Amino acid sequence: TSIFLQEWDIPFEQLEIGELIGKGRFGQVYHGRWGEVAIRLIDIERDNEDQLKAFKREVMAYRQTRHENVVLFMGACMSPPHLAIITSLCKGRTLYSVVRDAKIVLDVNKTRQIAQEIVKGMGYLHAKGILHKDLKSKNVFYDNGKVVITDFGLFSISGVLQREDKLRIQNGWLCHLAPEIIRQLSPDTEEDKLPFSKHSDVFALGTIWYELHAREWPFKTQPAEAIIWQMGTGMKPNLSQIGMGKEISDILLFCWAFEQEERPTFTKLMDMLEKLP
Amino acid sequence: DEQQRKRLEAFLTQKQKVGELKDDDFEKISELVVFKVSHKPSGLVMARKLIHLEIKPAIRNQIIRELQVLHECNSPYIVGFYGAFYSDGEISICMEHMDGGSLDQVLKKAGRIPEQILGKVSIAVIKGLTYLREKHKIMHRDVKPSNILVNSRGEIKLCDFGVSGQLIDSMANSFVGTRSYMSPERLQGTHYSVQSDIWSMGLSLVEMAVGRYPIPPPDAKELELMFPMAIFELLDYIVNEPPPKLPSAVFSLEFQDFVNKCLIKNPAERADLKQLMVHAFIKRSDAEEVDFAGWLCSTIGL
Ligand SMILES: Nc1ncnc2c1ncn2[C@@H]1O[C@H](COP(=O)(O)OP(=O)(O)NP(=O)(O)O)[C@@H](O)[C@H]1O
Ligand SMILES: Nc1ncnc2c1ncn2[C@@H]1O[C@H](COP(=O)(O)OP(=O)(O)NP(=O)(O)O)[C@@H](O)[C@H]1O
Ligand SMILES: O=C(NOC[C@H](O)CO)c1ccc(F)c(F)c1Nc1ccc(I)cc1F
Ligand SMILES: [Mg+2]
Ligand SMILES: [Mg+2]
Secondary structure, eight states, X not given: OOBOSTTSSSXXXXXXXXXXXXXXXXXXXXXXXXXXXXXXXXXXXXXXHHHHHHHHXXXXXXXXXXXXXXXXXXXXXXXXXXXXXXXXXXXXXXXXXXXXXXXXXXXXXXXXXXXXXXXXXXXXXXXXXXXXXXOOGGGEEEETTEEEEOOTTGGGGTOSOOOTTEEEEETTTGGGSOHHHHTTOOTTOOGGGSOOOHHHHHHHHHHHHHHHHHSSOTTOSSOHHHHXXXXXXTOOOOSGXXXXXXXXXXXXXXXXXXXXXXXXXHHHHHHHHHTOO | OHHHHHHHHHHHHTTTTOSOOOGGGEEEEEEOXXXXXXXXXXXXXXXXXXXXXXXXHHHHHHHHHHHXXXXXXXXXXXXXXXXXXXXXXXXXXXXXXXXTEEHHHHHHHSSOOOHHHHHHHHHHHHHHHHHHHHHHOOOOSOOSGGGEEEOTTSOEEEXXXXXXXXXXXXXXXXXXXXXXXXXXXXXXXXXXXXXXXXXXXXXXXXXXHHTSOOSSOOOHHHHHHHOOOOHHHHHHHHHHSOOOOOOTTTSOHHHHHHHHHHTOSSTTTSOOHHHHHTSHHHHHHHTOXXXXXXXXIIIIIO
C-alpha cells in the first residue's frame, strides 16, 4: 500500500526541495538536492487503488533501467495522498526550447545525430518492454550534444484529460498521436485505456523528425477538430516545401505510415538514419 | 431603425463613464469563464470574461492592441465592448451584460424554439456577419448557439468572434466535445471564408428548431417522440454523409429551403450573405409582428 525510499539502490540519506522548475499539467517539478536532482510531486485522490498498485509495478519497472540516452530514474516514495518521482536533473535546455531558438543552427547532420540518440534510447526502453506513451520535444533534453529522454510512462497514471462532455486538448498533443489513437479520442476517454503501442511511439518520433527540420509542429495553423479528422483519414505533410531531399522525407513516410505494421522498429529506424547524406 | 441609433448613441454616452479598467474595480455578482460583475468607478453592471494565459508581456501587448479595435466596431447586432486589460495571468474582455443569456441555454429552458423567432434570429445573424465582413474584413469563425446573446429589450447580438489572430494562437488548450459546428471545408483544411459561418448558422438553426443536435440524424421513433460516439466518427459524418435536414411536415417550405441552402457542403454552392438577404424566408420574417421580448420573458422567467 506504500513504497519507501530505502527500497532503492541509490543510497538515500536526505532530500532537499528547492524552487519550482516550471509549470506542468502533471504534478509540480521542483529542484532538489541529494548532487542536484529533479523532484516531481504528484497527488493521488485515494481512489482506483488497483490502478494505484499498477503504478507501483510500473515504477518498479523503472528501477531496472539505466541508459545514457534515458533519464536516470533515482527513486520514488509514496505516502498517499502524496507521491514523488525523483529523477536525475538535466542540465541544458529542452529540445523544444532549442528547436525554437533562432540563434542556434540545426544543420542536417546535427538533426540526424539528435534523432539517432533519441532512437537509441527509445530502442532501449522498447527492449525493456516499456512504452513511453508521450514522446515529444518538451520531454527531451539537449546539452551540447548530450540527448536524454524524459517522462516515459507517466501518461498512463497522468490524468491530464480530467468540462462536461468536452475533452481537453493542448496544442502539441494531437500531432504526436498515431491515427489508431486519434480515431479513439472521445470526451470520456482516459489515458489508462488508450491503445498505445511501440508503433505509436515510432509515430511520435516521426513527429519530432518533422519538428527538427521545420522548427515547428505539423498542423501548426489549423485548429484541433481539423487536426483530428485529417490525421484520422491519413493525411500527412511533407518537407519538400522547405527544400528537403527525398532521403529526409522517406523518414516521415515510414514513421507516419497509416497502417501500424508498416512502421519500422527503432533498430530498423536507426539503420535508416545511418544512411542519410 | 431610428430607435437602434438612439440606444447605440446612448451606449456611447456610457462609454466615457470609465476610462481604464483593472481588477479592483469589479465585484463578482454571479457566474453565467465569464462573470457578471458590478463596476464601482461607474454604475454599469458588466460582463467580464477571463482567459487564462501564461505568456510573456510582449505578445500580450500585441493582444491588447488587436483587442482595442472592438472599441471601433459598433452595431445593433453585435454586443458592445468596454475594454480589455491584463491582470494576474488572465486577460479580461469587458462587454455588455445581456440578461437573456445565450441561445443554447434558452433552448435548454424551452422545449423547441418556434419558426417565427428563428426568423428574426436569422435576420440579425446575417446582418451581423455582413457588418463584420463589409466594414471590418473579419469573419466570425465561431458561430454557434452559445455565442448568440439575447436580452429583455428584444435585441440579439453576436459575440466571441475572432478579431485577434494572435489570441487564437496564444490559447494553450482547446475543448473538443460531442457538438461540433465547424464547416466541412474547415475540417478538411482547405480555404474558407464567411461561407463557413453560414454553415455554422444553418446547423445552429436546425438544432434550435428541433431541440436536439441533429448529427447523427434521429431515427423514426425519436422524430415521433419529439412531436456513445467517438469524436472522429462525428467529424467524418459531417464531411462524408449528407447534411441534416428539417422534418418536412412541421416547418414551412421557405424555412426548409433556407437551412438547406445554408448546409450545402460545397461552399461555392452554399448561399452567401447577399443571397440569404433576399431568400423568401427572411423577407417573410422581416415583415412580421412578433414580440421577441415577450416570448423571452414569458418562457425563461424575467
Ligand atoms: N529532468 C528534468 N530536468 C530539468 N527540468 C525538468 C526535468 N523534467 C522536467 N523538467 C521541467 O519541469 C517543467 C515541467 O515539466 P513537465 O511537467 O514534464 O511538463 P512538460 O513536459 O515540459 N510540458 P507538458 O507535459 O505538456 O505539461 C518544465 O519546465 C520541464 O522542462
Ligand atoms: N456576454 C455574455 N452575456 C451573457 N451571458 C454570457 C455572455 N458570455 C457568455 N455567457 C454565458 O456564459 C457561458 C460561457 O460561454 P463561453 O465562455 O464562450 O463557453 P461556451 O460558450 O459554453 N463554449 P466555448 O465558447 O466553446 O468555450 C455561455 O454559454 C453563456 O451561457
Ligand atoms: O471569445 C473568443 N472565442 O474564440 C475561441 C477560439 O476561436 C477557439 O478557442 C475570442 C476569440 C478571439 C478574439 F480575438 C476574441 F476577442 C475573443 N473573445 C471576444 C470577442 C469579441 C467580443 I464583443 C467579446 C469577446 F469575449
Ligand atoms: Mg513532460
Ligand atoms: Mg462564448
